[PDB]
Amino acid sequence: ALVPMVIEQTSRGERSFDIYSRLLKERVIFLTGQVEDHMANLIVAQMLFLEAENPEKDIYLYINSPGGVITAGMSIYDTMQFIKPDVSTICMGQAASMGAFLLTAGAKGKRFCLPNSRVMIHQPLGGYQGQATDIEIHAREILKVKGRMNELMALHTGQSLEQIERDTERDRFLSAPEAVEYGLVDSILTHRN
Amino acid sequence: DIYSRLLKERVIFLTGQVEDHMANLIVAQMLFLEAENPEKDIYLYINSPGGVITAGMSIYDTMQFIKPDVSTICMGQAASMGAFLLTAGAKGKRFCLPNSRVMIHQPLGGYQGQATDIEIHAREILKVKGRMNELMALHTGQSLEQIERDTERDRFLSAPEAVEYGLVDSILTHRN
Amino acid sequence: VPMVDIYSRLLKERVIFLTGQVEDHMANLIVAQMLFLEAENPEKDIYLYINSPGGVITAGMSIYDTMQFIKPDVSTICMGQAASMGAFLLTAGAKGKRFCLPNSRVMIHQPLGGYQGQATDIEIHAREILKVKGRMNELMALHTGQSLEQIERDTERDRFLSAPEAVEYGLVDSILTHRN
Amino acid sequence: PMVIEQSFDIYSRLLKERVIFLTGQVEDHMANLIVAQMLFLEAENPEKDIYLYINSPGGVITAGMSIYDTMQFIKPDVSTICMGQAASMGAFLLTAGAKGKRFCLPNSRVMIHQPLGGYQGQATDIEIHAREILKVKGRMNELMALHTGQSLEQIERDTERDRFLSAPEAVEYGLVDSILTHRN
Amino acid sequence: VPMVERSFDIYSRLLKERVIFLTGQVEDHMANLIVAQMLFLEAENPEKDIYLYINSPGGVITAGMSIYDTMQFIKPDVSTICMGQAASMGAFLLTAGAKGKRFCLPNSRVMIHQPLGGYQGQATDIEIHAREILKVKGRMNELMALHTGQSLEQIERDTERDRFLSAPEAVEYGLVDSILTHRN
Amino acid sequence: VPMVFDIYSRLLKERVIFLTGQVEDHMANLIVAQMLFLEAENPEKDIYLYINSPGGVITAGMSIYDTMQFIKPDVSTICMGQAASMGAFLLTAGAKGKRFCLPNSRVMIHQPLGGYQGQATDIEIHAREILKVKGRMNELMALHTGQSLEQIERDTERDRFLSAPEAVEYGLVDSILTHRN
Amino acid sequence: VPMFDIYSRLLKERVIFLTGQVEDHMANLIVAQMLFLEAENPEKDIYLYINSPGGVITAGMSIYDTMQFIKPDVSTICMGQAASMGAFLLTAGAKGKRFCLPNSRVMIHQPLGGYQGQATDIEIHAREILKVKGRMNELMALHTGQSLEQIERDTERDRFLSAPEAVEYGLVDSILTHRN
Amino acid sequence: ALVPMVIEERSFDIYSRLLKERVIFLTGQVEDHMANLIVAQMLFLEAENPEKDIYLYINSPGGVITAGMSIYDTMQFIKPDVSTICMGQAASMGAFLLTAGAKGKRFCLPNSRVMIHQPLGGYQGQATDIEIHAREILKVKGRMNELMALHTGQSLEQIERDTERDRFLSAPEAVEYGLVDSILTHRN
Amino acid sequence: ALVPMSFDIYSRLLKERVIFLTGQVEDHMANLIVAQMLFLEAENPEKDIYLYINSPGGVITAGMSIYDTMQFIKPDVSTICMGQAASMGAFLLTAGAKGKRFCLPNSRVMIHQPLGGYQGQATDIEIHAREILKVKGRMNELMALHTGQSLEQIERDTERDRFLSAPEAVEYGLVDSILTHRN
Numbered sequence A: 001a002l003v004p005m006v007i008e009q010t011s012r013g014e015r016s017f018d019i020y021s022r023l024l025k026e027r028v029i030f031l032t033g034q035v036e037d038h039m040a041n042l043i044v045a046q047m048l049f050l051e052a053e054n055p056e057k058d059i060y061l062y063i064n065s066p067g068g069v070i071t072a073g074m075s076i077y078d079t080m081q082f083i084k085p086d087v088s089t090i091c092m093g094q095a096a097s098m099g100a101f102l103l104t105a106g107a108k109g110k111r112f113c114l115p116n117s118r119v120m121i122h123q124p125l126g127g128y129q130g131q132a133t134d135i136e137i138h139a140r141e142i143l144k145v146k147g148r149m150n151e152l153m154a155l156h157t158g159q160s161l162e163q164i165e166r167d168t169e170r171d172r173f174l175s176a177p178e179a180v181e182y183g184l185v186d187s188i189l190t191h192r193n
Numbered sequence B: 001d002i003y004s005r006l007l008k009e010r011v012i013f014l015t016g017q018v019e020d021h022m023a024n025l026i027v028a029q030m031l032f033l034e035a036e037n038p039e040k041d042i043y044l045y046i047n048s049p050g051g052v053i054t055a056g057m058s059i060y061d062t063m064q065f066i067k068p069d070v071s072t073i074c075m076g077q078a079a080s081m082g083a084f085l086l087t088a089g090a091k092g093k094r095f096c097l098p099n100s101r102v103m104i105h106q107p108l109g110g111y112q113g114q115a116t117d118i119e120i121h122a123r124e125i126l127k128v129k130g131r132m133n134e135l136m137a138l139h140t141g142q143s144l145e146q147i148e149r150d151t152e153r154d155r156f157l158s159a160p161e162a163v164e165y166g167l168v169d170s171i172l173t174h175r176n
Numbered sequence C: 001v002p003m004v005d006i007y008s009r010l011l012k013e014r015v016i017f018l019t020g021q022v023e024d025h026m027a028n029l030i031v032a033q034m035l036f037l038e039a040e041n042p043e044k045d046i047y048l049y050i051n052s053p054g055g056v057i058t059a060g061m062s063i064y065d066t067m068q069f070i071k072p073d074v075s076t077i078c079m080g081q082a083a084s085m086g087a088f089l090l091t092a093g094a095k096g097k098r099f100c101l102p103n104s105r106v107m108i109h110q111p112l113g114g115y116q117g118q119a120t121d122i123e124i125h126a127r128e129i130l131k132v133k134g135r136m137n138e139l140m141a142l143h144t145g146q147s148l149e150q151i152e153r154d155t156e157r158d159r160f161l162s163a164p165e166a167v168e169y170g171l172v173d174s175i176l177t178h179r180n
Numbered sequence D: 001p002m003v004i005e006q007s008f009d010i011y012s013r014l015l016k017e018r019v020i021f022l023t024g025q026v027e028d029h030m031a032n033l034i035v036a037q038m039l040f041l042e043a044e045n046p047e048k049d050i051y052l053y054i055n056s057p058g059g060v061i062t063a064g065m066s067i068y069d070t071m072q073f074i075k076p077d078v079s080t081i082c083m084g085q086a087a088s089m090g091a092f093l094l095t096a097g098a099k100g101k102r103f104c105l106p107n108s109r110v111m112i113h114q115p116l117g118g119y120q121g122q123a124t125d126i127e128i129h130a131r132e133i134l135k136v137k138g139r140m141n142e143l144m145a146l147h148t149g150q151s152l153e154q155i156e157r158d159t160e161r162d163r164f165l166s167a168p169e170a171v172e173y174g175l176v177d178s179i180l181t182h183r184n
Numbered sequence E: 001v002p003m004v005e006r007s008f009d010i011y012s013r014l015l016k017e018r019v020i021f022l023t024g025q026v027e028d029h030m031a032n033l034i035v036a037q038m039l040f041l042e043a044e045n046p047e048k049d050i051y052l053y054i055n056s057p058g059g060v061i062t063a064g065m066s067i068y069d070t071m072q073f074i075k076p077d078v079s080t081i082c083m084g085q086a087a088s089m090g091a092f093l094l095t096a097g098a099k100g101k102r103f104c105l106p107n108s109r110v111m112i113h114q115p116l117g118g119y120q121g122q123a124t125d126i127e128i129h130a131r132e133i134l135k136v137k138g139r140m141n142e143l144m145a146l147h148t149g150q151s152l153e154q155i156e157r158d159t160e161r162d163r164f165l166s167a168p169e170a171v172e173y174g175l176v177d178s179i180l181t182h183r184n
Numbered sequence F: 001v002p003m004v005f006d007i008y009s010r011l012l013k014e015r016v017i018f019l020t021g022q023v024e025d026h027m028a029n030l031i032v033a034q035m036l037f038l039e040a041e042n043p044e045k046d047i048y049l050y051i052n053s054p055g056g057v058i059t060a061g062m063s064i065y066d067t068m069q070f071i072k073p074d075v076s077t078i079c080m081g082q083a084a085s086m087g088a089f090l091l092t093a094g095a096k097g098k099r100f101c102l103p104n105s106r107v108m109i110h111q112p113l114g115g116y117q118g119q120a121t122d123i124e125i126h127a128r129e130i131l132k133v134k135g136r137m138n139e140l141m142a143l144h145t146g147q148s149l150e151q152i153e154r155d156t157e158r159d160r161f162l163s164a165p166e167a168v169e170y171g172l173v174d175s176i177l178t179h180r181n
Numbered sequence G: 001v002p003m004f005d006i007y008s009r010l011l012k013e014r015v016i017f018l019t020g021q022v023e024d025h026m027a028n029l030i031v032a033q034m035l036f037l038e039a040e041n042p043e044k045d046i047y048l049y050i051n052s053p054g055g056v057i058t059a060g061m062s063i064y065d066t067m068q069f070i071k072p073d074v075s076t077i078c079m080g081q082a083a084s085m086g087a088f089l090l091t092a093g094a095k096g097k098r099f100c101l102p103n104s105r106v107m108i109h110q111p112l113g114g115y116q117g118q119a120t121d122i123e124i125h126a127r128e129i130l131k132v133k134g135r136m137n138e139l140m141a142l143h144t145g146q147s148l149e150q151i152e153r154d155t156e157r158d159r160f161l162s163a164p165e166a167v168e169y170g171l172v173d174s175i176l177t178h179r180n
Numbered sequence H: 001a002l003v004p005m006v007i008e009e010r011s012f013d014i015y016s017r018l019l020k021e022r023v024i025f026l027t028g029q030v031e032d033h034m035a036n037l038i039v040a041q042m043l044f045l046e047a048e049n050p051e052k053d054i055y056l057y058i059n060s061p062g063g064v065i066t067a068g069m070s071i072y073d074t075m076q077f078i079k080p081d082v083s084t085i086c087m088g089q090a091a092s093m094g095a096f097l098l099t100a101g102a103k104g105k106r107f108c109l110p111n112s113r114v115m116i117h118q119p120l121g122g123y124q125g126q127a128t129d130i131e132i133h134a135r136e137i138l139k140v141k142g143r144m145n146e147l148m149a150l151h152t153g154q155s156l157e158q159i160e161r162d163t164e165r166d167r168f169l170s171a172p173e174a175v176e177y178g179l180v181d182s183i184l185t186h187r188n
Numbered sequence I: 001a002l003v004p005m006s007f008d009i010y011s012r013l014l015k016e017r018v019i020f021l022t023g024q025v026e027d028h029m030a031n032l033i034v035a036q037m038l039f040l041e042a043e044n045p046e047k048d049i050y051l052y053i054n055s056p057g058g059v060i061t062a063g064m065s066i067y068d069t070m071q072f073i074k075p076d077v078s079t080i081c082m083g084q085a086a087s088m089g090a091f092l093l094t095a096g097a098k099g100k101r102f103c104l105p106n107s108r109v110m111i112h113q114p115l116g117g118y119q120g121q122a123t124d125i126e127i128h129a130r131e132i133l134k135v136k137g138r139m140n141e142l143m144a145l146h147t148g149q150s151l152e153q154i155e156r157d158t159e160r161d162r163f164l165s166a167p168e169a170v171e172y173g174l175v176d177s178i179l180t181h182r183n
């Protein structure tokens, strides 16, 4: 039924798990599609759940996303940094905009691209409508957000802030090897050994 | 052609929303009247809720450029760009009808796109805001700082209040 | 229609029609017609037929101030109905020269409006429509001869008046039945 | 929504730890859900803290006030944690948390402003509804002043137009008590 | 949505403690559900109070009256609690609660007004339907007078247009008995 | 439109043409026909093109541009309100010494925008084409303004707004018209 | 519509405009203008300005055959763009009298179409558009001087040409820059 | 439209049942969420038993390339072989994922059809940004052609020539092309 | 779910190896049919499967996913037309195991050629028209095989919609007989 169930055994008896809750028992979380508040809250809740079950074991965050809303992405980002476990990140398909941000935000040494995934980074997009006074207020805010985002990308990639600023004024696409070279991820996963 | 008839008496009507084509129609009429006689006054009746600033400025500059004085007359209302054009009329020849109202405020706008472009378009509408306030101060006799304070939010003025503010010169009540 | 135009024809006799909803452009058409007529002859009366459910106050006030400004008297004739701004412009006609047809009706009420936005701006716009309301009530008290308080009480909700009741109220001067 | 049958999602899973999420637009039904969770948790244990995560652009004031008054009424402390953003009613409910237990995540943002509204109708009714939203605005300003430590006059000035705050600025403003960066 | 061997949604959990939520617009089906919950609760214990939380902008009068007559018919007291807002029919049902057991949360608001309606058709039918809504208005005013202690004439005057009341004003008017602030 | 001859036709006999609103094929064709007609009435006398436009379609704008250059009379341009994108391009394309801004008009310049949908092969074809158009427009812009090609390129990667005085300094127009002399 | 309009005036100068999408009714206007001009003077050139993205082929062929049938030469002038059928009609002008303005562009490609229905009917309509394609390629070859095989290769996908390239391709004979 | 259940008490939908037998269905257009579901099933199966084959039935008109590549790389990464079976059709990304199956274990049903072609895309915006997005989709086109060459045994040059326009193949033509290894007709 | 204990009436009949194909044929309902056949085959590769068909037809490739599954699996698939079997529905009806294809007495069958549609460059139009003509040929060949009619007869009869009563469908070779009352 759309999402398949699996049957796992006792403890107290047979119990049904949808395929995602099943993978969750293996410390795996999926980030898929556009980033927005509710899908982001779901991810946050999963991260919290997993930290609790075991604050010492790694969490694996698969990312396939075109990007999305920045504040929603930051609820995930700050959770990744806050919880005790390392969050290993794995890009499959693509990680663009906020998707790329969260990918590179993973634990150092534990950020990966699948061989044919692609990454894209760029500056924030936005929009307001209203009085000039309010326009200035909202324009200043998004410039502050852009700057803050550039700083964090600088931190996680190892690139200079100026390098990040220059490279993200317009859409920049990277292959998996180019992403390793850029510092967005640490290596490429090709085969289970 | 009741309007064409009145155009022959150097009367032009600015009615409704200010936008490029109705503004162009006003500009063409002003150019025509100037030509037919550069010495005689032109009368611009204004009844408008406002509209697009660049379209309004095409009228503003035409009003200043041509040789004849442009007398402005507010009937009903002159709001936003409508109030601007009302107050832009020739000194001593700007009028309100007794029950017209005037409203002044700052520019509204909107953009969508990359942050870099958002800054560019924000800087531009802020510059336009600044320029409009300077022109408003110039024509009303109010200080720039006074205009800035009074146009942050919508400000309504009755006809007598508009005379005192310097937006118009007097009220027309009955023909002489 | 009817392409000889029937209105252009009637305009030559200083007859103007205000028909349907009051808004800026039809109001501007009326103002233009009054100006033309004043010029054509500043001493002869103008006849304004009114059949209207009302409309935008500022557009209506462009007609009102024009009526008061020009030198000729504007005789007003209510046909069908004169409601809201229609009733206002009817009673605004030259004293002694305001008429209802026998089966026309008049309706008076307070202004309607609406805003959306910040509370500060809501307060600004509410304050404005209240000023307009007060001003409209003063002008109606003035033209009907009613006290301001009577106008205020009667326009809080829709008030319908027959042609005889409109004469009695002071909205018009008399009823026209048959041409003399 | 991460489902184990016995319909039991990740949120039900987190509720077992007295953690509640306020996410997205504030309105009557999502708020009723929040109130119900707080009532359930209080009973399960009236002495242990409740944790309310907030990620919201704001929403309807009367709905927000259902959550506010419930937060104050129940016996447990409600610790509030801003993630992503807390704007308008979201910021209001955030600062409404138990003193000392209101937090911002490092890269969350807070925004405060005055109420928005709208009416359509007769001038008399317009006036009734305008005075009502002005009364609501005053009440909100008083409560904000109370919870932040700012003066009423300061809140009034600062909320005439949208005001954005970083997490450090929100601490400095008194909206929250501290920034959470890493699990203890 | 939140769940808590056995499984049960949180509203079901609260229902077992005689708490019913009335949230949003009053209409036939949501009203049916409330009536049904009241009956269930009476059976479970005809002596213990029932608590009806109200957060509503109002709604359909006949729907509301199905709740009203049910509140009056059953044996248990129905204590009413306003959270967020109780407007129009929401306010009526709030004040219809058991005397001494009607409450406002400190920052909830109440609004009262007359019925709204509309018909279209022949003048003869227009008269029939106009006469009917006038009868409903009269009855609603009588019952409002009954529960508030206000005179019929005062209710009539006070409800010709929307009237908003703060929680203290609602106690003063007699719509509710007191304010709930803090648990014991 | 008032009669006196419609107001625009009346102005046309005085060699005045209005370019108003978005540039597209049919309004552009109207401009072109007016220019051909005027060239006719007198191949020696100046033509006046008032411009108030947010821009529009490039190929439509180029029909006006090439007509301006082809015909015998000088086409003097006057910006009122605004001249943006293609509107700015046509403004600066006027006869040298006869390009004007009204004092409170504004000018905006940027690169072309476009869009295609289809197979990668065709995307490549259409992408290369708009890139050629971009280069041609920058060369022509450099030509009429006096700016270097490299300068035009850098300044038009994003929207660049100019006041009437700034447009004069940039070389987009020759001077400001303030009062009829 | 600056007025007798500006187009009627230019028509008196044997100038016809083909502007926008090619379809039956605008095409019929062009054919009618050409017939009229042939009449007024069967020996003098007709000037056809073209600014078009293309359009319906049969509609374009009504113009094409009219151009060839009438006695006067039809000179074609591309301003802005001549794409698809627009480019076809440009190149179809009288030998030696086909022009591009300097910054006009030309685009050529194969026909587009679409059908839906039974497989049998799909086959009928596919066969037809393929015949139209072949016929258009032959005609393009004829007017450009290119070989049939060169046209076929160059029009499988959109091919853009600058004004100098269009002269070199044989689509037009020269570039007009300034009037003689 | 409901999914059939079975009682045995306990219950499960037939798809969950087939999943326990290591059968996964890829059906309809390829897009992120259905692709994620396929990825998750593959992960789950690798788990239950990293040595046993996984069977992916494919009936798809194609879809989003990046979504398809999330499946492609998962197929390549996991330890078990992924056998692919085309029923109905495998077009565009569907044909790509079909040919990406474990060598020797890629099948067409007798009346399935396969279609291969180059990527489609579209952008709107400034010329500078148009160039960036055109450059990117051309890189993608190139990468897909290389991978197609790899799995089919065709030369990169042959793949390039054959995919400029839609190319349809019958099941025997798909075997001859190297898209699949054989045709499944009847069960053993 | 409609009639459950969710365990609906269809799940109950599935336990008796009865599958329903109802309404328009498209990928997802087809996949559901395929999944049920696979499930039934595994539970018992020797017992017949019963496929009830009431369908106006639908997408050919979706239908062929069902067809090839029917032929691949070990059990015989008996087909029963109720109401109607039109286009792809008639095809799957006649695709059942020979001797085990039935019409109910007042069901009707309709056969015809493929329908389709494309839009684009002439070159691409040719590619897609050639493809639907190949599909048409293959479907005519398969219809001839299962009905016993000559290729020429199928072709002549399917250029336009051809309606058949249940007796006419038996006589045509589309089904083997009519089911009227249960044994």
Ligand SMILES: CC(C)(C(=O)NCCSc1ccccc1Cl)S(=O)(=O)c1ccc(C(F)(F)F)cn1
Binding pocket: A048, A049, A050, A052, A053, D013, D014, D017, D019, D051, D079, D101, D103
């Ligand atoms: C909000 C908290 C309580 C939280 O998320 N708790 C639940 C973790 S999920 C979980 C826990 C145990 C067992 C099972 C699960 Cl799923 S917290 O650990 O992020 C937290 C938040 C705030 C504070 C403090 F600020 F009060 F110190 C301390 N801890």
Ligand SMILES: CC(C)(C(=O)NCCSc1ccccc1Cl)S(=O)(=O)c1ccc(C(F)(F)F)cn1
Binding pocket: B031, B032, B033, B035, B036, F010, F011, F014, F016, F048, F076, F098, F100
């Ligand atoms: C653009 C001009 C020619 C203009 O508006 N001309 C027509 C005025 S309308 C008219 C004129 C004569 C007779 C009848 C009419 Cl309707 S101008 O007079 O505003 C003008 C514009 C520019 C320059 C100059 F910059 F070249 F000096 C000189 N004059």
Ligand SMILES: CC(C)(C(=O)NCCSc1ccccc1Cl)S(=O)(=O)c1ccc(C(F)(F)F)cn1
Binding pocket: B005, B006, B009, B011, B043, B071, B093, B095, C035, C036, C037, C039, C040
């Ligand atoms: C704006 C004026 C000039 C006006 O309406 N003029 C045209 C009247 S219509 C007309 C006049 C003459 C012949 C034919 C017609 Cl239709 S006015 O008479 O209302 C007027 C308006 C303002 C002033 C003054 F303020 F300058 F004194 C003087 N007169």
Ligand SMILES: CC(C)(C(=O)NCCSc1ccccc1Cl)S(=O)(=O)c1ccc(C(F)(F)F)cn1
Binding pocket: D039, D040, D041, D043, D044, E013, E014, E017, E019, E051, E079, E101, E103
């Ligand atoms: C309405 C009440 C009864 C309430 O929320 N009850 C249910 C609490 S949820 C719960 C309780 C016990 C066990 C488990 C759960 Cl989930 S109350 O505690 O808010 C309340 C409301 C009103 C009054 C009084 F006014 F009658 F005194 C007393 N108590």
Ligand SMILES: CC(C)(C(=O)NCCSc1ccccc1Cl)S(=O)(=O)c1ccc(C(F)(F)F)cn1
Binding pocket: E039, E040, E041, E043, E044, E069, E070, E071, E073, E074
């Ligand atoms: C119709 C009756 C039999 C009724 O509601 N019966 C079922 C009550 S719910 C119940 C009873 C026993 C055990 C369990 C439950 Cl849930 S009643 O006549 O007792 C009755 C009950 C209630 C009302 C009213 F409150 F709606 F007016 C009117 N009549």
Ligand SMILES: CC(C)(C(=O)NCCSc1ccccc1Cl)S(=O)(=O)c1ccc(C(F)(F)F)cn1
Binding pocket: F036, F037, F038, F039, F040, F041, G009, G010, G013, G015, G047, G075, G097, G099, G179
């Ligand atoms: C196309 C032509 C004839 C044109 O526009 N003619 C009409 C000009 S409008 C006119 C002219 C005189 C009097 C009145 C009017 Cl409206 S042209 O003069 O631009 C032209 C175009 C092309 C060639 C040539 F290539 F054949 F040399 C020669 N002349």
Ligand SMILES: CC(C)(C(=O)NCCSc1ccccc1Cl)S(=O)(=O)c1ccc(C(F)(F)F)cn1
Binding pocket: G035, G036, G039, G040
């Ligand atoms: C259809 C015809 C009559 C036609 O277009 N006639 C009108 C030309 S427009 C014209 C001609 C002269 C004067 C004024 C005008 Cl507008 S024709 O000349 O193209 C024509 C068409 C067909 C035949 C014939 F086949 F019968 F011989 C002879 N002539």
Ligand SMILES: CC(C)(C(=O)NCCSc1ccccc1Cl)S(=O)(=O)c1ccc(C(F)(F)F)cn1
Binding pocket: A022, A023, A026, A028, A060, A088, A110, A112, H043, H044, H046, H047, H048
């Ligand atoms: C992210 C991992 C842990 C993963 O997909 N786990 C879920 C496997 S599903 C599963 C496995 C066992 C039992 C049950 C299930 Cl559902 S992984 O095997 O793809 C993996 C990913 C990354 C790394 C490393 F980079 F850290 F080395 C090592 N392993």
Ligand SMILES: CC(C)(C(=O)NCCSc1ccccc1Cl)S(=O)(=O)c1ccc(C(F)(F)F)cn1
Binding pocket: H017, H018, H021, H023, H055, H083, H105, H107, I038, I039, I040, I042, I043
């Ligand atoms: C894909 C396969 C394995 C399949 O359909 N498997 C699941 C059958 S359903 C089932 C099976 C066992 C128990 C319960 C159920 Cl429901 S197959 O039988 O169609 C198949 C497909 C391919 C090959 C081979 F090519 F590798 F030989 C062999 N078998």
